[PDB]
Design an enzyme around this catalytic site. Structure first.
Site, PDB file in Angstrom:
ATOM      1  N   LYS A 161      31.742  41.546 -30.569  1.00 43.44           N
ATOM      2  CA  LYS A 161      31.934  40.805 -29.338  1.00 43.44           C
ATOM      3  C   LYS A 161      33.236  39.993 -29.415  1.00 43.44           C
ATOM      4  O   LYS A 161      33.942  39.826 -28.418  1.00 43.44           O
ATOM      5  CB  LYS A 161      30.719  39.917 -29.061  1.00 43.44           C
ATOM      6  CG  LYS A 161      29.499  40.737 -28.596  1.00 43.44           C
ATOM      7  CD  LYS A 161      28.286  39.889 -28.289  1.00 43.44           C
ATOM      8  CE  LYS A 161      27.125  40.756 -27.813  1.00 43.44           C
ATOM      9  NZ  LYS A 161      26.359  41.231 -29.011  1.00 43.44           N
TER      10      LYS A 161
ATOM     11  N   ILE B  53      10.920  21.958 -17.481  1.00 48.82           N
ATOM     12  CA  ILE B  53      10.965  23.364 -17.070  1.00 48.82           C
ATOM     13  C   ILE B  53      11.555  24.148 -18.235  1.00 48.82           C
ATOM     14  O   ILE B  53      12.735  23.999 -18.535  1.00 48.82           O
ATOM     15  CB  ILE B  53      11.789  23.584 -15.787  1.00 48.82           C
ATOM     16  CG1 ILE B  53      11.099  22.915 -14.582  1.00 48.82           C
ATOM     17  CG2 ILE B  53      11.978  25.091 -15.492  1.00 48.82           C
ATOM     18  CD1 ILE B  53      11.894  23.000 -13.290  1.00 48.82           C
TER      19      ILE B  53
ATOM     20  N   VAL C  30      27.649  35.093 -39.013  1.00 53.19           N
ATOM     21  CA  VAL C  30      28.387  36.012 -38.152  1.00 53.19           C
ATOM     22  C   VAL C  30      28.246  37.429 -38.678  1.00 53.19           C
ATOM     23  O   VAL C  30      28.753  37.748 -39.753  1.00 53.19           O
ATOM     24  CB  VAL C  30      29.897  35.646 -38.058  1.00 53.19           C
ATOM     25  CG1 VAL C  30      30.657  36.705 -37.286  1.00 53.19           C
ATOM     26  CG2 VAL C  30      30.088  34.277 -37.398  1.00 53.19           C
TER      27      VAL C  30
ATOM     28  N   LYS D  51      33.668  37.823 -39.377  1.00 50.10           N
ATOM     29  CA  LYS D  51      32.461  38.321 -40.037  1.00 50.10           C
ATOM     30  C   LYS D  51      32.304  37.778 -41.452  1.00 50.10           C
ATOM     31  O   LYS D  51      31.204  37.793 -42.009  1.00 50.10           O
ATOM     32  CB  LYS D  51      32.434  39.854 -40.067  1.00 50.10           C
ATOM     33  CG  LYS D  51      31.038  40.415 -40.370  1.00 50.10           C
ATOM     34  CD  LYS D  51      30.921  41.894 -40.075  1.00 50.10           C
ATOM     35  CE  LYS D  51      29.529  42.386 -40.427  1.00 50.10           C
ATOM     36  NZ  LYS D  51      29.192  42.019 -41.832  1.00 50.10           N
TER      37      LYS D  51
ATOM     38  N   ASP E 165      12.329   7.930 -26.684  1.00 50.00           N
ATOM     39  CA  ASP E 165      11.125   8.304 -27.396  1.00 50.00           C
ATOM     40  C   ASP E 165      10.756   7.185 -28.330  1.00 50.00           C
ATOM     41  O   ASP E 165      11.639   6.546 -28.908  1.00 50.00           O
ATOM     42  CB  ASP E 165      11.328   9.589 -28.174  1.00 50.00           C
ATOM     43  CG  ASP E 165      11.545  10.778 -27.268  1.00 50.00           C
ATOM     44  OD1 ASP E 165      11.263  10.659 -26.057  1.00 50.00           O
ATOM     45  OD2 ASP E 165      11.956  11.838 -27.769  1.00 50.00           O
TER      46      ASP E 165
ATOM     47  N   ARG F 220      23.676   6.591 -37.295  1.00 48.78           N
ATOM     48  CA  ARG F 220      24.806   7.071 -38.106  1.00 48.78           C
ATOM     49  C   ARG F 220      26.139   6.573 -37.551  1.00 48.78           C
ATOM     50  O   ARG F 220      27.197   6.899 -38.077  1.00 48.78           O
ATOM     51  CB  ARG F 220      24.819   8.602 -38.186  1.00 48.78           C
ATOM     52  CG  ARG F 220      23.563   9.214 -38.780  1.00 48.78           C
ATOM     53  CD  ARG F 220      23.778  10.656 -39.190  1.00 48.78           C
ATOM     54  NE  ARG F 220      24.475  11.434 -38.172  1.00 48.78           N
ATOM     55  CZ  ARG F 220      23.867  12.136 -37.223  1.00 48.78           C
ATOM     56  NH1 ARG F 220      22.544  12.151 -37.158  1.00 48.78           N
ATOM     57  NH2 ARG F 220      24.583  12.813 -36.331  1.00 48.78           N
TER      58      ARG F 220
ATOM     59  N   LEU G 184      32.308  34.846 -42.176  1.00 44.89           N
ATOM     60  CA  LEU G 184      31.592  33.588 -42.063  1.00 44.89           C
ATOM     61  C   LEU G 184      30.092  33.827 -42.062  1.00 44.89           C
ATOM     62  O   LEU G 184      29.613  34.824 -41.522  1.00 44.89           O
ATOM     63  CB  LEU G 184      32.019  32.837 -40.803  1.00 44.89           C
ATOM     64  CG  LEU G 184      33.489  32.433 -40.690  1.00 44.89           C
ATOM     65  CD1 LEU G 184      33.734  31.743 -39.354  1.00 44.89           C
ATOM     66  CD2 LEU G 184      33.905  31.534 -41.847  1.00 44.89           C
TER      67      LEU G 184
HETATM   68 NA    NA Z   1      14.081  22.323 -19.485  1.00 42.40          NA
HETATM   69 NA    NA Z   2      28.867  37.250 -42.072  1.00 42.95          NA
END
Ligand code: NA
Ligand code: NA
Length: 327
Positions: free
Chosen positions: A66, A100, A59, A54, A248, A177, A56
């Site tokens: 969890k 989709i 978070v 937490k 692209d 890069r 971080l």
């Molecule tokens: Na998709």
């Molecule tokens: Na945090």
DNA sequence: CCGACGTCGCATCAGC
DNA sequence: GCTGATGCGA
DNA sequence: GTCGG
């Protein structure tokens, strides 16, 4: 930091991210889990508790909780349940087809269409983009080795110059890069005749030539400034043929080109550091321009840009190679 | 407590 | 037929 | 879900 260190946690968070985006259609929760998964993947210690995590940024209380459950039990009840859910896991999976999204995947699963097989049986329910995504499902999830990218670049730069030797083309993305592999190819195109203040033909002629030499094989979308499609290296002799790849191509006015190149070179993280650094010097850089604030905060006219470096100069920052732009 | 949290070009839908 | 909204990808 | 005005 290695996968072994917090991979279970970041895998968990990324899976939760995907269900938020594709099933719950909660894009901001999706980005929340992804940001947490990122800051954890960069954390150079095996996490021992949710309380530790937490600290971080990104978070919060619920992810800490969890992480506690995961650490003590090696799984997450909510995730185990949604994984087994026929509807949800099918919705989530269908979105792996390009074209989709969460909304289309929801509708398909509503009418009983759940698998690639079901999609295959129901072509008339697919739009053009979605059919191409289905056709190349496997290929699109493969990565592109840098060597193939170089070969792809060879063709692209060659055929662009052949159309008009005054085009300028630049392959950006992680490839520029120096990445060892790429997810697709992103090409930035400009021409001295195309500025902000100024044909609606320049992009079409390049696409056309790349289709003429059978490099481009399919079109997802195409307008006057953006092309999205599919391409393929020619098969060498009698060898195994290359995967079809996503490419692209976008046309940018000459005066906004290098802002374009800088931006689409990334990384994502670098662009924000740079763009903060950025505000602090009194300038405003989007994907198109750099502009000065502005004592109240009133952005003025776009400054002249004629290289990437020009931008760096403006914000008293020393030019940095694409190779040193991970952050 | 409660809103912000990349954005935009293209394809296609929804409505007129 | 046209105009604006929505879905999508990146 | 997390952060912060
Ligand atoms: Na998709
Ligand atoms: Na945090």
């Amino acid at each position: 930091p290695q996968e072994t260190l917090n991979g279970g946690i970041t895998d968990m968070l990324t899976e939760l991210a995907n269900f938020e985006k594709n099933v719950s259609q909660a894009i901001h929760k999706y980005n929340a889990y992804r940001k947490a998964a990122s800051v954890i993947a960069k954390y150079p210690h095996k996490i021992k508790s949710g309380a530790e995590a937490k600290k971080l940024p990104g978070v919060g209380t619920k992810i800490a909780e969890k992480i506690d459950e995961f650490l003590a039990t090696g799984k997450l009840r909510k995730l185990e349940k949604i994984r087994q859910d026929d509807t949800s896991s099918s919705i989530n999976f269908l979105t792996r087809v390009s074209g989709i999204g969460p909304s289309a995947a929801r509708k398909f699963v509503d009418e009983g269409i759940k698998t690639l097989e079901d999609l295959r049986k129901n072509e008339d329910k697919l739009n053009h983009h979605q059919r191409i995504g289905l056709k190349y499902f496997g290929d699109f999830e493969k990565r592109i080795p840098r060597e193939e990218m170089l070969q792809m670049q060879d063709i692209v730069l060659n055929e662009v110059k052949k159309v008009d030797s005054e085009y300028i083309a630049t392959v950006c993305g992680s490839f520029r890069r120096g990445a060892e592999s790429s997810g697709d190819m992103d090409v930035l195109l400009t021409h001295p005749s195309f500025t902000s203040e100024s044909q609606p033909k320049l992009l079409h002629q390049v696409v056309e030539q790349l289709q003429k030499v059978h490099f481009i094989t399919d079109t997802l979308s195409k307008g006057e400034t953006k092309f999205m499609g599919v391409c393929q290296l020619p098969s060498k002799n009698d060898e195994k043929e290359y995967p079809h790849r996503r490419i692209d191509i976008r046309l940018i006015p000459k005066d906004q080109y290098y802002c374009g190149v800088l931006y689409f070179t990334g990384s994502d993280i670098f662009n924000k550091n740079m763009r903060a650094h950025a505000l602090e010097k009194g300038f405003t850089i989007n994907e198109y321009t750099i502009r000065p604030l502005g004592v109240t905060g009133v952005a003025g006219e776009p400054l002249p840009v004629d290289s990437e470096k020009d931008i760096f100069d403006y914000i008293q920052w020393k030019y940095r190679e694409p190779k040193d732009r991970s952050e």
